[PDB]
Enzyme design. Sequence first.
Site, short mmCIF file in Angstrom:
data_model
loop_
_atom_site.label_atom_id
_atom_site.label_comp_id
_atom_site.label_asym_id
_atom_site.label_seq_id
_atom_site.Cartn_x
_atom_site.Cartn_y
_atom_site.Cartn_z
N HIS A 83 0.81 -1.23 0.00
CA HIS A 83 0.00 0.00 0.00
C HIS A 83 0.84 1.28 0.00
O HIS A 83 0.80 2.10 0.95
CB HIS A 83 -1.00 -0.04 1.15
CG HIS A 83 -2.12 -1.00 0.85
ND1 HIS A 83 -2.20 -2.23 1.47
CD2 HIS A 83 -3.16 -0.87 -0.01
CE1 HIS A 83 -3.30 -2.80 1.00
NE2 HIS A 83 -3.89 -2.04 0.08
N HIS A 87 1.43 1.59 -5.84
CA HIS A 87 0.13 0.95 -5.97
C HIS A 87 -0.91 1.99 -6.45
O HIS A 87 -1.65 1.71 -7.41
CB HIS A 87 -0.33 0.34 -4.64
CG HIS A 87 -1.80 0.01 -4.58
ND1 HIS A 87 -2.36 -0.95 -5.42
CD2 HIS A 87 -2.76 0.52 -3.78
CE1 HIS A 87 -3.66 -0.98 -5.09
NE2 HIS A 87 -3.94 -0.12 -4.10
N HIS A 123 -7.05 7.00 -3.22
CA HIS A 123 -7.84 5.98 -2.56
C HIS A 123 -7.20 5.22 -1.40
O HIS A 123 -7.97 4.66 -0.63
CB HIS A 123 -8.45 4.98 -3.55
CG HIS A 123 -7.54 3.82 -3.85
ND1 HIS A 123 -6.47 3.96 -4.71
CD2 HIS A 123 -7.52 2.57 -3.31
CE1 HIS A 123 -5.84 2.77 -4.71
NE2 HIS A 123 -6.43 1.92 -3.87
N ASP A 124 -5.86 5.19 -1.28
CA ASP A 124 -5.22 4.49 -0.13
C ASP A 124 -4.31 5.44 0.65
O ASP A 124 -3.40 5.00 1.34
CB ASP A 124 -4.43 3.24 -0.59
CG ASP A 124 -5.27 1.96 -0.66
OD1 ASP A 124 -6.20 1.79 0.18
OD2 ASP A 124 -4.96 1.11 -1.53
N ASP A 235 -8.52 -1.23 -8.42
CA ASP A 235 -7.80 -1.62 -7.20
C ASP A 235 -7.17 -3.01 -7.28
O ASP A 235 -6.17 -3.26 -6.60
CB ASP A 235 -8.75 -1.57 -5.99
CG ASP A 235 -8.16 -1.06 -4.68
OD1 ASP A 235 -6.91 -0.96 -4.56
OD2 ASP A 235 -8.94 -0.79 -3.77
C1 LIG Z 1 -5.72 -5.18 -0.16
C2 LIG Z 1 -6.65 -6.22 -0.79
C3 LIG Z 1 -7.93 -5.72 -1.42
C4 LIG Z 1 -8.14 -4.37 -1.69
C5 LIG Z 1 -9.33 -3.93 -2.28
C6 LIG Z 1 -10.33 -4.84 -2.61
C7 LIG Z 1 -11.56 -4.38 -3.31
F1 LIG Z 1 -11.39 -3.21 -3.91
F2 LIG Z 1 -11.99 -5.25 -4.24
F3 LIG Z 1 -12.56 -4.21 -2.52
C8 LIG Z 1 -10.12 -6.19 -2.33
C9 LIG Z 1 -8.94 -6.62 -1.74
N1 LIG Z 1 -5.90 -7.11 -1.75
N2 LIG Z 1 -5.24 -6.59 -2.85
C10 LIG Z 1 -4.58 -7.58 -3.43
C11 LIG Z 1 -3.66 -7.36 -4.60
C12 LIG Z 1 -4.38 -7.27 -5.90
F4 LIG Z 1 -5.17 -8.29 -6.11
F5 LIG Z 1 -5.13 -6.16 -5.98
F6 LIG Z 1 -3.52 -7.24 -6.91
C13 LIG Z 1 -4.82 -8.79 -2.73
C14 LIG Z 1 -4.42 -10.17 -2.88
O1 LIG Z 1 -3.72 -10.60 -3.80
N3 LIG Z 1 -4.93 -11.03 -1.91
C15 LIG Z 1 -5.76 -10.58 -0.92
O2 LIG Z 1 -6.22 -11.47 -0.10
N4 LIG Z 1 -6.14 -9.33 -0.77
C16 LIG Z 1 -5.67 -8.45 -1.67
MG LIG Z 2 -7.76 0.46 0.40
ZN LIG Z 3 -5.77 0.08 -3.15
#
Ligand SMILES: C[C@@H](c1ccc(C(F)(F)F)cc1)n1nc(CC(F)(F)F)c2c(=O)[nH]c(=O)[nH]c21
Ligand SMILES: [Mg+2]
Ligand SMILES: [Zn+2]
Lengths: 343, 347
Positions: A83, A87, A123-124, A235
């Site tokens: 974050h 990103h 957004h973050d 995101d």
């Molecule tokens: C911070 C979180 C997250 C942010 C935001 C949203 C929404 F916006 F969909 F709500 C969902 C989820 N996030 N971000 C990733 C990286 C990405 F996949 F983006 F490359 C991952 C991941 O690979 N595995 C996770 O369990 N959580 C992850």
């Molecule tokens: Mg966020």
């Molecule tokens: Zn984000």
Amino acid sequence: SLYKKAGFYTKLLHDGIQPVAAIDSNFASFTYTPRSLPEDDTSMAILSMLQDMNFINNYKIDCPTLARFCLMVKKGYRDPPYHNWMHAFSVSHFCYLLYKNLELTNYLEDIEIFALFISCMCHDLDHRGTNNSFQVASKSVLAALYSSEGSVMERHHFAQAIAILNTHGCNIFDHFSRKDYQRMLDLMRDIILATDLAHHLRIFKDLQKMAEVGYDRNNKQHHRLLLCLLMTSCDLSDQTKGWKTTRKIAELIYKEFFSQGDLEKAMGNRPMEMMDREKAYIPELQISFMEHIAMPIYKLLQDLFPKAAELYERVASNREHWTKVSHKFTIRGLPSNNSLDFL
Amino acid sequence: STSLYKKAGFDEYTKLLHDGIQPVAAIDSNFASFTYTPRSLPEDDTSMAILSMLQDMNFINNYKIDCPTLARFCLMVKKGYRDPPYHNWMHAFSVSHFCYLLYKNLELTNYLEDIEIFALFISCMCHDLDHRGTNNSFQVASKSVLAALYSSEGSVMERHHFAQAIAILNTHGCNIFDHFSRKDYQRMLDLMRDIILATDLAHHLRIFKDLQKMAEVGYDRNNKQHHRLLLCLLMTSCDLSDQTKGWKTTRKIAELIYKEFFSQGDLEKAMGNRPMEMMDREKAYIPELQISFMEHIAMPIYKLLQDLFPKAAELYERVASNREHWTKVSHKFTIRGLPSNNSLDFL
Ligand SMILES: C[C@@H](c1ccc(C(F)(F)F)cc1)n1nc(CC(F)(F)F)c2c(=O)[nH]c(=O)[nH]c21
Ligand SMILES: [Mg+2]
Ligand SMILES: [Zn+2]
Ligand SMILES: C[C@@H](c1ccc(C(F)(F)F)cc1)n1nc(CC(F)(F)F)c2c(=O)[nH]c(=O)[nH]c21
Ligand SMILES: [Mg+2]
Ligand SMILES: [Zn+2]
């Protein structure tokens, strides 16, 4: 778990606005990996994207104020593994890709597209490398301020964005009418709050119905739902890139999540399995995340925009790659050197 | 047909500012007392009384509010309520009056910022705008436009009340705070949002433990969360303030509440659904329902208020006294629902 804030321009004034093709011939393609751009060139790329979408001219944005705003937003991010500013920059670049590849102007108003892009940048803001549950557990000042209303971090990200707008010489919407200024704040609030996964989970059925019935450009709620879906697709856009990008982002995500888990253990609390380096099995966690979270978002995007088919196929392919590589990943957590290069 | 509640217009002004704003003592010598019953004021005098209260709290002068804009805003808010038995303008007016009583009797300026007290009063006027005489569960069950817009986030009606308040401010000639700075305008909107959303009982129950913790450790005027919690508590105390009046008021308000609730229950039965027991005129036993409401919802709010403000002791004592009155009633009330004439005058 210590992530610092860098604080509390002439290069941008001289040649901050460049034609996007000079940055990369593939800059406006879904196959471009914005993380390949040097961090020192990201502010110039932001201005170049705003110029290419013609927002600087159309909204009569003062370029020196826009350059200061961009630098403030960049300085607004801490340095956790995931974050961070790179990103936010990559999420902003995906918003630009949606504008260039899908026919956004045929679904949303220009002001909504502009707010989506600015919201991607912000957004973050000031993320601490910890989730909302951690804020409540650590009894943080952010949880004290926002937990009763929901989405602690997201309310903070929006508050930080507003604080930048209120900083002398950074208000890119300063000349807007009181009505348009308020419209920007409302759109930024709704779009940033849409980044809380809990919000996406609560509205999924409504996004599903919008794609089932068909997108109606005269329906104000359809505009709100589409903005939520587009924001979540930006995101999660690192998952639409090649396997090497997906692998590296898993390394960054889990280094960040495992540091939260270590901190929770030091506080005498048991972390969620996915945040615990002694329990988490990354390929299984990523397959579940791809199946339940990322793939449905890109399938909805494909249903509303036929040109988005390649995004869903890439996400599905990256999910299949985890199954095939799991035979070589025989441990919980990350290797001693925190790298997944061995895969 | 008793579930049909009309809007007077779509989402008396020159007459309202002809003789200027009236001093509160000219309205009634007892106007600033906990013994005043605002439901006794003729409905046509309520808009002037709102301006009189804002003048007496010195908000018109301190914030240089334009009086014609304030008069138009007040009339728009009044016209923004439908006519169900309980959730009508006289309820919003009575809730706003109680806010004024807390200002006058509890010396709120020693606990909250001026802008917070101002937002609390405006939120009191707006807090039930466009209420349909139905609860949040009904919006979801009837698949209403309001549930479609807000059901995922909870507090369906309260999010609608806030949206209606914003629409009034956005009506030409009604923006009472449009001269505020961008920072102060945003502060007002955030305060109104939070205070109106605090009127959802589910929100009150979620923050209850934190309100108890604040009352135990003691109010800290330098703690931002304490100001936020206090505003939620004061809003809920304004919303239930009919219970701090005499027995005649408590009895009449039970008649209004149950006429409204039972009409929702009848509507749910007509839709093929079994309503909540408190909304079913064939199952509801009003004295027991009122004793439960008083002991589990109203008394704890006024007990927290007394814990924070010793001068609020009389409010808690009155609510406890009205609860004892329902216990006396339960030994001389042998019916379910309301009597066929819809009157509790037999008590
Ligand atoms: C911070 C979180 C997250 C942010 C935001 C949203 C929404 F916006 F969909 F709500 C969902 C989820 N996030 N971000 C990733 C990286 C990405 F996949 F983006 F490359 C991952 C991941 O690979 N595995 C996770 O369990 N959580 C992850
Ligand atoms: Mg966020
Ligand atoms: Zn984000
Ligand atoms: C609409 C509801 C209600 C509103 C608001 C809050 C909160 F703000 F506290 F959350 C709780 C409860 N409400 N209002 C009254 C009338 C009053 F007591 F106010 F005089 C009653 C009542 O007598 N019995 C009930 O079962 N519910 C009642
Ligand atoms: Mg209400
Ligand atoms: Zn009310």
